[PDB]
């Protein structure tokens with residue numbers, strides 16, 4: 001069983017959508033991805049709920065209450081073989097000095113959530 | 125009328141299980157009955173990938189490890205999360221119109237899903253697969 005560690009992120013309160021997703025994609029991802037490779041993460045996914053996606057969402061879910069949408073700005077996901085990869089990555093000195101502090105730039109940790117699931121995946 | 129280039133999309137369904145249903149019957153139903161019912165429709169409409177996330181007896185002790193010192197409220201406690209990766213929302217809209225989809229897979233949800241306590245999401249995704257290829 002592969003595991004998936006997901007963090008549902010609400011963006012910084014004084015932060016625009018454009019600044020938030022610019023940061024996540026263009027500054028945080030290149031800073032983050034080296035460590036995920038180092039610790040043998042299988043896949044890193046970033047889900048974006050922004051101006052590009054929101055109209056297609058509205059199209060998909062029109063006529064339901066808006067409350068029916070899980071409305072985080074970004075969802076961060078890594079598929080790992082075990083949680084030791086994550087635990088070990090968390091103890092990494094550079095990860096702690098550079099990428100962990102980076103969350104000051106985009107994530108409101110008081111309005112974000114995490115979830116560790118095990119997955120079944122089917123690729124067509 | 126000229127469109128910005130397409131980005132991969134992820135349609136996520138966040139499912140709370142039927143209240144009168146144990147976790148074990150929830151995930152067995154999801155793995156063993158729904159997923160095979162569902163999958164042929166995902167192929168038929170060119171779905172790129174189908175992921176089922178389980179939050180259950182197997183995953184929870186590891187989730188508790190990762191979230192040491194964090195309140196229960198910080199946990200997204202849906203029982204299962206369904207993700208289909210598609211290249212355009214047209215795949216999904218049209219799959220949603222399929223008569224057998226509506227006849228079998230949609231109503232199967234009365235066997236595992238509390239839809240009043242379920243949510244949906246349509247995002248665009250960036251993805252990095254680390255496998256050397």
Ligand SMILES: CC(C)(C)C=C=C(Cc1cccc(C#N)c1)C(N)=O
Nearest residue numbers: 007009028032076090099100103107
């Ligand atoms: C919560 C969110 C989305 C910011 C995760 C992230 C990181 C790095 C980071 C920072 C703080 C704690 C952990 C752990 N475990 C990991 C990133 N996006 O670089």
